[PDB]
Design a protein around this ligand. Sequence first.
Ligand code: CA
Ligand code: CA
Length: 307
Amino acid sequence: KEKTFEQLHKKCLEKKVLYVDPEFPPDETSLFYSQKFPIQFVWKRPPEICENPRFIIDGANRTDICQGELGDCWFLAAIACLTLNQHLLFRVIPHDQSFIENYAGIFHFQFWRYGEWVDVVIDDCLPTYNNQLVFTKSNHRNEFWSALLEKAYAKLHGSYEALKGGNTTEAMEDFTGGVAEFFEIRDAPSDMYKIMKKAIERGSLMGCSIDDGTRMACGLVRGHAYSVTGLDEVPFKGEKVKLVRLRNPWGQVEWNGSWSDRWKDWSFVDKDEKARLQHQVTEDGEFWMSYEDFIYHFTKLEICNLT
Ligand SMILES: [Ca+2]
Ligand SMILES: [Ca+2]
């Protein structure tokens, strides 16, 4: 108890044993405090789940974040935003971690808490059912960085259940130590597109949501956070059209209106722009929409400005 990551790992390696966390053990206490999850979960380490597990494959990026049967929409919308700033990402995720080298069933991450970087140590046991992850997972079957990161943040809040509610800005600050700002869309001035654009390039993280006071006909989900991942202008039919790119951390459901993946007027654009906008018909959870529709549908915009 109360020992550093550094030592603890070395200890486990020399005793040739896999770490088990005393303070956040693989049982029902770490899962919930009040309400029980109905299906009985099995705890399993990633080597027990698949043949060749890996920490990170071909970069830690936003496609590695897919929500499970947990309602931590806010947290993921922030991790996804964070992968848009790689150098910032490596402060949170120590990069020298592996399943093929010096593996001792122990991993660790860093969060910004009360004005300082703090380290979190965890065992690699993860909740599963039918030998597959129940909570956040990567879209690549062998990636476990995101599943582990979630677990660490769950420990920080005492349980997985404790994540069920929250605001994205809380996670953004926990990853950056920056200062959060909110805009209510109507009270946002006319130059908001420009404000968003300045924020993105500065490397600041941006989330948004549609107030709760597919889910909607139009492909959007209410009271569920989205990551803002791009802003651009395209010349279309002789006029320049302002666009906004968003990502649903569900990675499964997107906007079906104008500028969506399967929109037919994509035909009136040149390869360059399309290539530049990385346009792809992929049910990845990411999509473009017009600035006008964005402002029309969304009600809250949050920015965490870097410190
Ligand atoms: Ca990846
Ligand atoms: Ca897509």
